[PDB]
Design an enzyme around this catalytic site. Structure first.
Site, PDB file in Angstrom:
ATOM      1  N   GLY A 130       0.760  -1.255   0.000  1.00 48.92           N
ATOM      2  CA  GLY A 130       0.000   0.000   0.000  1.00 48.92           C
ATOM      3  C   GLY A 130       0.787   1.300   0.000  1.00 48.92           C
ATOM      4  N   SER A 134      -0.073   7.931   3.420  1.00 45.50           N
ATOM      5  CA  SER A 134       0.366   8.121   4.806  1.00 45.50           C
ATOM      6  C   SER A 134      -0.034   6.969   5.737  1.00 45.50           C
ATOM      7  CB  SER A 134      -0.169   9.448   5.343  1.00 45.50           C
ATOM      8  OG  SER A 134       0.356  10.532   4.588  1.00 45.50           O
ATOM      9  N   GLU A 159      -3.107   3.237   2.902  1.00 44.81           N
ATOM     10  CA  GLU A 159      -4.530   3.061   2.678  1.00 44.81           C
ATOM     11  C   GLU A 159      -4.924   3.061   1.207  1.00 44.81           C
ATOM     12  OE1 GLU A 159      -3.133   5.983   3.300  1.00 44.81           O
ATOM     13  OE2 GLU A 159      -4.346   7.526   2.325  1.00 44.81           O
ATOM     14  N   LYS A 204      -8.656   4.262  -2.538  1.00 52.54           N
ATOM     15  CA  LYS A 204      -8.314   4.774  -1.224  1.00 52.54           C
ATOM     16  C   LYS A 204      -9.400   4.353  -0.246  1.00 52.54           C
ATOM     17  CE  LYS A 204      -7.532   8.895   1.547  1.00 52.54           C
ATOM     18  NZ  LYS A 204      -7.863  10.336   1.710  1.00 52.54           N
ATOM     19  N   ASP A 218      -4.270  20.213   1.258  1.00 52.20           N
ATOM     20  CA  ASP A 218      -3.083  19.412   1.577  1.00 52.20           C
ATOM     21  C   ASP A 218      -2.182  19.273   0.367  1.00 52.20           C
ATOM     22  OD1 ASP A 218      -1.305  17.993   3.175  1.00 52.20           O
ATOM     23  OD2 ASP A 218      -2.507  16.149   3.277  1.00 52.20           O
TER      24      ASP A 218
HETATM   25  C1  LIG Z   1      -9.552   9.216  -3.498  1.00 55.44           C
HETATM   26  C2  LIG Z   1      -8.665  10.448  -3.590  1.00 55.44           C
HETATM   27  O1  LIG Z   1      -9.127  11.374  -2.593  1.00 55.44           O
HETATM   28  C3  LIG Z   1      -7.267  10.025  -3.367  1.00 55.44           C
HETATM   29  C4  LIG Z   1      -6.149   9.709  -3.146  1.00 55.44           C
HETATM   30  C5  LIG Z   1      -4.794   9.320  -2.904  1.00 55.44           C
HETATM   31  C6  LIG Z   1      -4.237   9.657  -1.673  1.00 55.44           C
HETATM   32  C7  LIG Z   1      -2.940   9.300  -1.382  1.00 55.44           C
HETATM   33  C8  LIG Z   1      -2.176   8.617  -2.310  1.00 55.44           C
HETATM   34  C9  LIG Z   1      -2.698   8.265  -3.555  1.00 55.44           C
HETATM   35  C10 LIG Z   1      -4.027   8.621  -3.842  1.00 55.44           C
HETATM   36  N1  LIG Z   1      -1.748   7.562  -4.321  1.00 55.44           N
HETATM   37  C11 LIG Z   1      -1.948   7.089  -5.625  1.00 55.44           C
HETATM   38  N2  LIG Z   1      -3.181   7.158  -6.129  1.00 55.44           N
HETATM   39  C12 LIG Z   1      -3.462   6.746  -7.360  1.00 55.44           C
HETATM   40  N3  LIG Z   1      -4.748   6.862  -7.832  1.00 55.44           N
HETATM   41  N4  LIG Z   1      -2.539   6.241  -8.159  1.00 55.44           N
HETATM   42  C13 LIG Z   1      -1.284   6.130  -7.737  1.00 55.44           C
HETATM   43  C14 LIG Z   1      -0.928   6.548  -6.459  1.00 55.44           C
HETATM   44 CL1  LIG Z   1       0.752   6.365  -6.001  1.00 55.44          CL
HETATM   45  C15 LIG Z   1      -0.569   7.292  -3.480  1.00 55.44           C
HETATM   46  C16 LIG Z   1      -0.748   8.134  -2.211  1.00 55.44           C
HETATM   47  C17 LIG Z   1      -8.769  11.109  -4.951  1.00 55.44           C
HETATM   48  N5  LIG Z   1      -7.942  11.985  -5.407  1.00 55.44           N
HETATM   49  C18 LIG Z   1      -8.172  12.480  -6.612  1.00 55.44           C
HETATM   50  C19 LIG Z   1      -9.259  12.007  -7.219  1.00 55.44           C
HETATM   51  S1  LIG Z   1      -9.991  10.846  -6.117  1.00 55.44           S
END
Ligand SMILES: C[C@@](O)(C#Cc1ccc2c(c1)N(c1nc(N)ncc1Cl)CC2)c1nccs1
Length: 314
Positions: free
Chosen positions: A62, A65, A68, A84, A170
């Site tokens: 995963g 932070s 998750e 997430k 953030d």
């Molecule tokens: C659900 C949401 O609030 C989110 C998120 C989110 C939060 C932390 C992290 C991610 C994602 N990461 C990645 N996420 C994707 N998708 N691919 C590759 C990675 Cl490395 C890593 C760390 C959304 N954010 C934007 C549209 S929905």
């Protein structure tokens, strides 16, 4: 009224639908229900249950932070994306409401959200280049032109959000994801978002946040410049000099002492205009994106490889 009726038709079920329907249902999240926005994730007989209709990557690794965020597969369509997990008890309506129905190259696409038990599973495009946070750890720190290049893209995302009176809340390297070749950057993680008219990362907090003062879009700008410093120096601001960091952000001068001397004058100038303690004096997303645009032109444009040679932090 009719909204009451639409919401009832959505509760208790997982459906394919539009962003607005996800928003409406989301609002009831303070049992398997939700809305999928892409053809690639499909409910089966009113349901979308983990390890039944979708499964996370084989040995459970995963990102994020709280570890998750996971790679996942729809069992019927075979489509790969990311999820997430948010604890329902702690789910913020705004993470979905300030997110659903957006469409910008600079913001990660929402694929849907489904409640199952104590979990809110939020689905989205899997960006294969990883986060800008991972890149910084990998490369030590980024070349100036790459840093500017990504700062501009983040700012374009903020432009788009600010125009819609959404505060990201953030902005940081960890929340900027990259395509598989590194050329496209996009904002993710609206867990801290707020619609304008649970706090972000402490090191990236603007003085007005830390001080409890009234906050607007300008907080994102400050965070983005802290992220810029993180990119250039390979560590967060305030780390090197400082005790609880939130005390120094309020009293102390902005961390402009952390601009590397090697940076070009307009890079330095731009980081300074985004790091004005008073929000009135701080640059807007549009203003700063333009500056950063010429800042990148001033150093000969984007030239350095996305994964070049390692470079020691400061
Ligand atoms: C659900 C949401 O609030 C989110 C998120 C989110 C939060 C932390 C992290 C991610 C994602 N990461 C990645 N996420 C994707 N998708 N691919 C590759 C990675 Cl490395 C890593 C760390 C959304 N954010 C934007 C549209 S929905």
């Amino acid at each position: 009224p009719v909204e009451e009726y639409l919401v009832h038709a959505l509760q208790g079920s997982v459906s394919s639908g539009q962003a607005h329907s996800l928003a409406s249902l989301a609002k009831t999240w303070s049992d398997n229900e939700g809305v999928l926005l892409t053809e690639k994730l499909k409910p089966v007989d009113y349901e979308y249950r983990e390890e039944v209709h979708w499964m996370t990557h084989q040995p459970r690794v995963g990102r994020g932070s709280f570890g998750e965020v996971h790679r996942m597969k729809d069992k019927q369509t075979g489509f790969q994306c990311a999820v997430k997990k948010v604890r329902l008890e702690v789910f913020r309506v705004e993470e979905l409401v300030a997110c659903a129905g957006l469409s910008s190259p600079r913001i990660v696409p929402l694929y849907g959200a489904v409640r199952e038990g104590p979990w809110v599973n939020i689905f989205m495009e899997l960006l294969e280049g990883g986060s800008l946070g991972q890149l910084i750890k990998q490369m030590g720190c980024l070349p100036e032109d790459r840093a500017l290049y990504y700062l501009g893209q983040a700012l374009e995302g903020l432009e788009y959000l600010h125009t819609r009176r959404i505060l990201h809340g953030d902005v940081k390297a960890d929340n900027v994801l990259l395509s598989s070749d590194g050329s496209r950057a996009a904002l993710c993680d609206f867990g801290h978002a707020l619609c304008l008219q649970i706090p972000g990362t402490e090191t990236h907090m603007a003085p007005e946040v830390v001080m409890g003062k009234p906050c607007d879009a300008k907080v994102d700008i400050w965070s983005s410049c802290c992220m810029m410093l993180h990119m250039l120096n390979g560590c967060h601001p305030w780390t090197q000099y400082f005790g609880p960091l939130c005390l120094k952000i309020a009293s102390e001068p902005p961390p402009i002492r952390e601009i590397p001397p090697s940076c070009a004058p307009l890079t330095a100038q731009a980081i300074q205009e985004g790091l004005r303690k008073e929000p009135v004096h701080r640059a807007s997303a549009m203003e700063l994106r333009r500056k950063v645009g010429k800042a990148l032109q001033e150093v000969g444009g984007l030239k350095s490889p996305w994964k070049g040679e390692y470079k020691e932090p400061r």
